[PDB]
């Protein structure tokens, strides 16, 4: 039902200065914090209105953590380049994905942590939250370092404790936007393609969260091949948009019906032309 | 709040 996720991106840029570290925080599909080492004096910036109520003690602590991670990932980029015997001229990326998933009840459902190198799985925390899965012999060196540092033990305690604890706090402070689902504004349109065939299109706009399913039915069947359903896209104001189109024989555009499924709507909604 | 343990790979 609810989740907190942190996204890290460490990119090396030889000849273009020191490596760039970007840290982004999320509560479901809503971004609430951002950090960029690129600035003259980098600091954690609010990205949601419900996180602005946090005291200066919160912001200075978050800035201290991400400043430490900036330096950590600079050494990690240097070490991983050595493990793969890579050139000092090439640009490489270390990505990290970690967080805690909360059930409909409000309890820890699943804790997770994953790290990548150049868009490839590198090291990941197992489902037991006690062991690591290394992708290769290079990731094994990282695993041994992380085992000696007791990363898995302190990460488990964070994911079971503070992660859940702060996610619950954020959900309460922003209950008017995070715990409130926005239903899609549905409407179908006019569109011809040939003299014998036309194109019916179903529109879904201004919905939150991004999870939605748009299907076309010629008297109840599914047309997976013959449905150009476009990928869910952000509107720009924290809402989303999606559409589905069908190749239709002119005259038969009345036995075609669109089914929209979202958590904003109480039960599936059906609309025609 | 993010994870407060920064470990070099």
């Amino acid at each position, epitope marked *: 039902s609810h989740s907190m996720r942190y996204f890290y991106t460490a990119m090396s840029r030889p000849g273009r200065g020191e490596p760039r570290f970007i840290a982004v925080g999320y509560v479901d599909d809503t971004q609430f914090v951002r950090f960029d080492s690129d600035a003259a004096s980098p600091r954690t910036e609010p990205r949601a209105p419900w996180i602005e109520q946090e005291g200066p003690e919160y912001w200075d602590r978050n800035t201290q953590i991400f400043k430490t991670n900036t330096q950590t990932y600079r*050494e990690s980029l240097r070490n991983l380049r050595g493990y793969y015997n890579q050139s000092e001229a090439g640009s490489h990326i270390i990505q990290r994905m970690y967080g805690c998933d909360l059930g409909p009840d409000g309890r820890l459902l699943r804790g997770h942590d994953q790290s990548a190198y150049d868009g490839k799985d590198y090291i990941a925390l197992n489902e037991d939250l006690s062991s690591w899965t290394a992708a290769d012999t290079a990731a094994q060196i990282t695993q041994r370092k992380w085992e000696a540092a*007791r990363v898995a033990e302190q990460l488990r*305690a964070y994911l079971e404790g503070l992660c859940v604890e702060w996610l619950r706090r954020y959900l309460e402070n922003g209950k008017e936007t995070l715990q409130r689902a926005d239903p899609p504004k549905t409407h179908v349109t006019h569109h011809p393609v040939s003299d014998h065939e036309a194109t019916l299109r179903c529109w879904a706009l201004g919905f939150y969260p991004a999870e939605i399913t748009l299907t076309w039915q010629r008297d109840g069947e599914d047309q997976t091949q013959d449905t150009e359903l476009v990928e869910t896209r952000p509107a720009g104001d924290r809402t989303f948009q999606k559409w589905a189109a069908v190749v239709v024989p002119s005259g038969e555009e009345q036995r075609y019906t669109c089914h929209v499924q979202h958590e904003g709507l109480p039960k599936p909604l059906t609309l025609r032309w | 709040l993010p994870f407060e343990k920064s470990t070099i790979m």
Partner: T-cell receptor
Amino acid sequence: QSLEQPSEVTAVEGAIVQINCTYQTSGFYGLSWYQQHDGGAPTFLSYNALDGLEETGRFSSFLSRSDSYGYLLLQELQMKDSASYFCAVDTGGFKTIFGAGTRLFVKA
Amino acid sequence: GVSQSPRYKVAKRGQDVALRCDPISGHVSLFWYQQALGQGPEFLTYFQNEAQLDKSGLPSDRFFAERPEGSVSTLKIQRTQQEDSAVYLCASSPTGGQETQYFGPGTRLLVLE
């Protein structure tokens, strides 16, 4: 952010001794123990991140996060064990808080 | 192990004192601590490679800590005062914070009039 441990503790040679530690902090990441001789380097004994017992030879350390309590147990006490024992708390990041220390006196 | 020099240092009020720390090779993290009689080490400054990530524990700007090559670290105390009299311990961790710390034998500093 602070932590409390007894000032002194005394035990006979060959016996066992317990050094208690309670911590008072906003965040918790780990509880560790260090041995320090007069004008010497503090040397690591054991680290507790999760609840339970850590065993390393004659020395063991327990931790209860819910009770914000931990202790160090030293078995088969020797004359060389007469030193200062410090419990350290990790609260996230890198800043470690150390206690005043417990001076152990091993009676010969 | 971690080494420190000098073991003992007696200084006159107003003098500049230089403290050296040679950590274990490859250890990314470096810590500086102050230790008063009958007390535990109190945090001064933290280094990850050559970058000084925090110095909130330093008593004043007179305390200048550096690690330019990301290995050997120096703590220079400008215009030493009697209040600076303490044991200055240095520690290192292999890959970051919240880890096992490896300490040096320290420097027992005494500042007199």
